[PDB]
Design a protein around this ligand. Structure first.
Ligand SMILES: OC[C@H]1O[C@H](O[C@H]2O[C@H](CO)[C@@H](O)[C@H](O)[C@H]2O)[C@H](O)[C@@H](O)[C@@H]1O
Ligand SMILES: OC[C@H]1O[C@H](O[C@H]2O[C@H](CO)[C@@H](O)[C@H](O)[C@H]2O)[C@H](O)[C@@H](O)[C@@H]1O
Lengths: 396, 722, 399
């Protein structure tokens, strides 16, 4: 019945992994800083009307364990009735938090919900949580576990994407991310991180290498425990895997956090909030977990059917740049026009904070739709384990 | 750029010997002690660049001093002036300072510290950056990180390096959290220092010898700290280690228990900086330490504590309240009149300082239980090893407990501690003033009786003075010297020197009924009793007292002082004005007397007492005063106690009872246990921080908000109003 | 709001004890796969491709419980790759939160058939193994006034006036009503015995139960992670309380056990297409909270909020099911809302059978579906106290 609307979508900058600016900032602090920015924009918001806080986190251990969402509620001084729950659906965890928030608002039993995610990969590296699929040999042997970097190379092998091809997308992401920054696209949505004294720590995406050239990308060496033989046991018609992915055409490992406010039209009207976009549809699907990164295509198909829409009805496509071939595969499958796809750069340039990316690229499209004065945007991410999450937003 | 820098004199003398061992001798020519000031930072900047330029001809470094002390403290004149907007400069200064020490640390070659004297605060931080430390075991030499006592933290690598050496828990508990100072023997014992020598002249030779040996015996580990080695293991584990992670959530709660919930942000910041620093590399850790340091220096608590325990305290120790021009006069034989818990405590701290005491009472049965106070205390010190058996026997042998008045001959210092009764003191002083030495000091330990009135019971009124101690005398550090209108400036200065000779701090106070300490601590106690009579829960009153920063909650303190003594003071004040609107506490005092409960002396008071030990609040207390019927905010209870004393301290400053804000702060802090975070009951006015503002102006705002709700006694005097 | 969410199945494993427990040798993934395979046994012709998500609560999702154990269950059990799989953590309520979220997904309409529940193998992944900012980081620990739940529970008993005999009386009541339910076959259809890869039995009952508990034996116990200054910290906020009466022991507190629970939830159209029969309807859900120092008074406002949301009162509810974390928490909840005694944890609770952090919410949720059915009653209300001062409540109506 109720319709779910996005009222705010902010994110911290993404600090790099080696000698990063954010490496000294606890991930809990990143979330609190975004909560305090929402307060700055809406000081007369009745926080008692925020019924939940839903954060994605792929590695909920160490500084990110013990339900980091509830910690953000108490540490930021929000009301104790504001809930707080962590969830983990791997790479899509950030968008999954937003989807769940919307679906909660549609059911009527929540009024105003904060959703997002946090990942300080320089403090909590991926894999810090362990996992059965990886460490238990009985079920590892049976689900044919293979790291995503190999699935991405396998994708490029089957589809015929050359090293030049994946590198050309990498160069394009750097160019489009740099042009968006210099164009002021990100001025209102990227909240600089400061310390307890107000001194600046980070106000831009450090992983960006905007002086990237096609020649420098070819100098890089590929990332390449016998996981190659495991993959080719299932994809038996493929003789050899072409290892095309390097650190220059793969998503950067960064720290960052993102926050989104979501509520009903009645909930927003009661708090003086102007809706910025409407959550039209969400869909979760999947594909083979050995190749692992082909989830976006069926998830995007499902959400277009569920919303009564087609590729022609979508103005902007944003797919998480986990690897170059993943985006190229998606672009080939659905015949996405090149000028509609990841228009402001993506994770290859700016970085991929696991628990937070979904809420970041979601907020990136709420901003770009308003700037271009466009209507719809489809947001998707490939997920570890063969999953796929897609979402359609409509500008208001 | 990012350098070892940022007009001032050069502080470090450079000397490279024929072996390639550089001797950096710090000798700031602006004062007697090496301070971490803008001059030092510049000098150490140049020297570190030179150690790197001439790295080919340098095999080792030695850091020494040309002062009596090694290196002590920071530039407090500067840090007390940092505003919140200066946090950028503060962060850059401590990072520059630590960038220098870090470069010295990773020089690729051993660096040894030659600690000839006190290495305190910033000084010990320099030595912790060296790979080896050698201390000259000399008298008065101390080593520690006392930054927390000024509301600061060891911001020059102290927190980071001590945690690297001892682990989180041991570095916090032993060194950082209370800024404990160590004698060179104790320093080597805990790992702060590595080895000792007999005299200072052996330091640099022993250092250059240690460099020469380290290079040949340990060629790969020369100039490499344990935490810069691959495979380093933090003592007790890192916060990710499961053994430490099991007990780690209890460190902030154990600290909250020790501080009783008071607003001291320095120990909180130290524990945070330690744990977060132990989660990251050494360089990221030291930067976190910088941010927590700037977080303190720009805050108000640090400015209060820096004003009190540095500027105010040094102004007092330097003879600020001492009359100018007077000369010293030695003391040879003290005579204590009365062997109560005061007279016995006066006989102990007088003998612990090396003075020959004569302790008289009204009976040999009671004078022996009086000297036995010095024996039961010398037994606690021999069981814990703090004193030898030879110095504990020479201490108790300078006490002679008697009941006769003839064996008072040769006494050149009389500190009377008899009961609080004027004509009794006139009698006790009359029968000794002639058989003691002729021109000796005549001192009284009265707590409310005017020294002017007591001075008429002797012939030499110019040598009659108040010398007010506090119980327990062995542990309280203040001596309130009361100047009667007959007292001369010499007797003032002589008791001033007596206080500094027994290891206590003196304030000078003009004669008035109640003096400073008693009168002010009266308003503190009466505020709690009023609240109790207003129906507030006693548990909330004690919690408000503890959480305000006081060493003892108010109702617990109201048992130590007799409730009958308070009734007496109230009758006295009413007598004076009539020959006065009563304070609401005066009804609680008499009501408690009427019920027969009056404190520890009666075995029954606000608390209950089983065979001499305190045990719980009296259960009948809630029915008597209808407790629970009034439930004001805790912060209102906290401010009511703090503001009553702060307002009463301004009244004393207005009336000429006190002559300096230094005496008002140190007097309130060391005398009546005013919370240290306030910096003293006078500093509390100019440094109040609340919701509605900060400074003297906000103090008045909060004063009127309290006066509108709880009584006009919370109305500020005019001297606070512009 | 449009689609109505219905419970179609609600099973669980027996709870194995912490010391020398039978379940200590079973990976927590296998506890989940075992429940999935029972659901296949009950409905061999279920088109699993209509299962759009698998939502598992888990409070310590590390080691054997990390890496999104929900998705691991989906891949391990051989479910379709389109079936998703997500882990969540809202402390003690993670089991019921997974069910509420599943229901809310069905109500939005963008999901059809959802598997929900939780897993927690506390004998292999002890609580706290995940760490956390509210505990291990001193900057915020000093501010949120962190206090272990066992001390807030004693603070509750001190404030409301629950004696040691009072809390031991409830503990006996729980052990009794749990032993009565087990002998009366109440749990025969829902507690799925755990077996190995050979079909040999590992566990078929709640090992933590002490059905021969006596009121004199409970008084012999000694009061109870709590060894620092937490007592003084709590009374700093609760400054009118002088002393904390430590009434809680291991015999009146929730037991530490291993276990897992699964609940199948879908729309009216979803179950009809698959030939399932709806057993109960999710009427309303609510989350609220209270002070996190005394963090266990959450159930009271969350229950009031779900009653006003569903347009009901305390009188309308036939069965109340509150998680027996600590005996004082239940006595407070009962004292607050005047819950009739004959309608409260009527099959015993966690004190007797155990409290697998991630799975409890779905375990006691499934306990009330079977008791509503066995009694032919209409409405049950399930609520849990949550760490950090949160509250979660759910009303279900029998269909
Ligand atoms: O526990 C969550 C709350 O933490 C803070 O409040 C605690 O600490 C305050 C400072 O002394 C107390 O006044 C308060 O009673 C404590 O609960 C924070 O200020 C709150 O906003 C949080 O909800
Ligand atoms: O036992 C090895 C088999 O691994 C794959 O099969 C799995 O496929 C999914 C996980 O990757 C799940 O449905 C389930 O764990 C298995 O069916 C592979 O597809 C098979 O060919 C292998 O025999």
């Amino acid at each position: 019945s109720e319709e779910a609307f996005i009222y705010e979508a902010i994110r911290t900058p993404r600090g790099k992994q080696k000698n990063g600016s954010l490496h000294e900032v606890k991930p809990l602090s990143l979330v609190v800083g975004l909560i305090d920015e929402l307060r700055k924009r809406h000081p007369d918001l009745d926080e008692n009307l925020i019924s939940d806080v839903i954060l994605g986190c792929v590695s909920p251990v160490g500084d990110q364990g013990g339900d980091i969402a509830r910690a953000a509620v108490l540490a930021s001084g929000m009301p104790v009735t504001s809930g707080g729950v962590q969830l983990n659906r791997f790479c899509a965890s950030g968008l999954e938090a937003v989807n769940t928030a919307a679906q909660k608002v549609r059911s009527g039993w929540d009024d105003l919900v904060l959703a997002g995610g946090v990942e300080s990969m320089s403090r909590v590296p991926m894999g810090s949580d362990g996992g059965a699929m990886g460490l238990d040999p009985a079920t590892n042997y049976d689900v044919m576990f293979v790291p995503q970097s190999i699935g991405a190379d396998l994708i490029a092998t089957i589809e015929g994407f050359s090293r030049e091809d994946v590198d050309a997308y990498a160069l394009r992401s750097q160019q489009k991310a740099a042009e968006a920054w210099s164009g002021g696209y990100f001025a209102k949505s990227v909240v600089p991180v400061r310390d307890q004294n107000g001194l600046l720590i980070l106000d831009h995406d450090e992983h960006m290498r905007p002086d990237t050239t096609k020649e420098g990308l070819a100098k890089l060496k590929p990332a390449f425990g016998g996981f190659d033989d495991v993959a080719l046991q299932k994809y038996h018609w493929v003789e050899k895997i072409n290892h095309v992915h390097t650190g220059g055409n793969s998503s950067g490992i960064v720290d960052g956090a993102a926050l989104v406010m979501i509520g009903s039209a009645a909930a927003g009207k009661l708090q003086g909030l102007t809706p910025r976009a409407r959550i039209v549809a969400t869909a979760t699907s999947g594909a083979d977990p050995v190749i692992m990164l082909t989830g976006p295509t069926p998830a995007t198909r499902k959400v277009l059917d569920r919303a009564g829409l087609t590729v022609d009805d979508i103005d902007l496509f944003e797919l998480n740049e986990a690897f170059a071939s993943v985006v190229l595969k998606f672009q080939k499958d659905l015949n996405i026009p090149d000028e509609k796809l990841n228009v402001n750069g993506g994770a290859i340039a700016m970085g991929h904070p696991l628990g937070a990316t979904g809420a970041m690229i979601l907020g990136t499209m709420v901003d770009e739709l308003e700037r271009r004065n466009a209507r719809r945007a489809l947001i998707t991410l490939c997920i570890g384990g063969g999953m796929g999450v897609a979402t359609i937003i409509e500008r208001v | 750029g990012s350098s070892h820098h940022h007009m001032p004199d050069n502080t470090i003398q450079w000397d490279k010997d024929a072996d390639g061992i550089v001797t950096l001798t710090m000798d700031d020519p602006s004062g007697s002690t090496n301070v971490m000031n803008e001059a030092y930072i510049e000098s150490m900047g140049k020297a570190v660049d030179r150690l790197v330029a001439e790295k080919d001809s340098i095999t080792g470094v030695v850091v020494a001093s040309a002062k009596k002390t090694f290196f002590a403290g920071g530039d407090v004149k500067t840090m007390i002036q940092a505003r919140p907007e200066d946090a950028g400069d503060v962060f850059n200064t401590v990072e520059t300072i630590k960038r220098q020490l870090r470069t010295l640390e990773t020089l690729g070659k051993p660096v040894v510290a030659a600690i000839n004297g006190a290495a305190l605060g910033g000084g010990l931080e320099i030595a912790l950056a060296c790979h080896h430390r050698i201390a000259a075991d000399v008298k008065g030499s101390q080593l520690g990180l006392p930054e927390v006592t000024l509301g600061l933290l060891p911001g020059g690598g102290g927190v980071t390096r001590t945690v690297r050496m001892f682990g989180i828990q041991n570095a916090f508990v032993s060194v950082l959290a209370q800024g404990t100072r160590f004698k060179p023997a104790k320093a080597k014992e805990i790992g702060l220092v590595d080895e000792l020598v007999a005299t200072v002249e052996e330091l640099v030779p022993a250092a250059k010898a240690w460099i020469k040996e380290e290079l040949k015996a340990n060629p790969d580990g020369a100039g490499v700290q344990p935490w810069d080695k691959k495979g380093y293991k933090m003592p007790g584990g890192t916060p990710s280690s499961p053994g430490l992670a099991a007990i780690l959530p209890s460190f902030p709660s154990n600290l909250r228990k020790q501080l009783k919930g008071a607003p001291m942000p320095a120990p909180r910041a130290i524990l945070a900086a330690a744990v977060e620093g132990a989660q990251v590399d050494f360089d990221t850790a030291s930067r976190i330490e910088s941010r927590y340091f700037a977080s303190l220096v720009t805050g108000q608590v640090a400015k209060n504590m820096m004003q009190a325990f540095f500027f105010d305290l040094q102004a007092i120790n330097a003879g600020g309240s001492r009359p100018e021009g007077i000369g010293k006069t030695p003391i040879k034989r003290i005579g204590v009149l009365g062997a109560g818990m005061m007279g016995a405590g006066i006989a102990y701290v007088s003998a612990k300082a090396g003075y020959e005491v004569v302790l008289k009472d009204v009976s040999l049965e009671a004078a022996a239980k009086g000297k036995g106070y010095s024996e039961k205390l010398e037994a606690k010190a021999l069981e814990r090893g703090r004193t030898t058996q030879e110095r504990s026997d020479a201490l108790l042998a300078r006490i002679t407990p008697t009941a006769d008045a003839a064996d008072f001959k040769g006494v050149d210092f009389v500190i009377e501690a008899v009961f609080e009764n004027q004509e009794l003191k006139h009698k006790v002083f009359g029968e000794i003033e002639d058989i003691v030495e002729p021109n000796a000091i005549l001192g009284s330990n009265t707590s409310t009786l005017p020294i002017t009135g007591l001075a008429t019971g002797v012939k030499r009124q110019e040598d009659f003075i108040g010398i007010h101690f506090f119980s327990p005398v062995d542990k309280m550090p203040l001596v309130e010297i009361i100047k009667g209108e007959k007292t001369s400036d010499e007797a003032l200065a002589r008791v001033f020197d007596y206080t500094l000779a027994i290891g206590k701090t003196p304030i000078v106070v003009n004669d008035s009924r109640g003096f400073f300490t008693s009168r002010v601590i009266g308003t503190f106690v009466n505020e709690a009793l009023a609240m109790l009579g207003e129906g507030v829960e006693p548990a909330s009153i004690e919690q408000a007292g503890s959480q305000a920063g006081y060493p003892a909650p108010p109702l617990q303190l109201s048992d130590e002082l007799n409730l009958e003594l308070m009734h007496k003071i109230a009758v006295a004040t009413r007598k004076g004005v009539e020959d006065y609107q009563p304070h609401p506490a005066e009804a609680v005092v008499e009501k408690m007397i009427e019920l027969g409960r009056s404190g520890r002396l009666k075995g029954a008071g606000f608390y209950e007492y089983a065979d001499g030990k305190r045990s719980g609040l009296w259960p009948g207390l809630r029915e008597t005063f209808k407790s629970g019927s009034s439930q004001p905010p805790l912060q209102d209870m906290i401010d009511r106690m703090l503001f009553a004393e702060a307002l009463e301290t301004q009244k004393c400053l207005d009336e000429g009872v006190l002559t300096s804000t230094a005496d008002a702060n140190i007097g309130s802090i060391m005398g009546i246990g005013f919370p240290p975070w306030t910096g003293g009951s006078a500093q509390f006015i100019v440094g109040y921080s609340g919701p509605a503002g900060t400074g003297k102006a906000a103090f008045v705002a909060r004063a009127r908000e309290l006066a509108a709700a709880y009584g006009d006694r919370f109305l500020p005097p005019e001297s606070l109003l512009s």
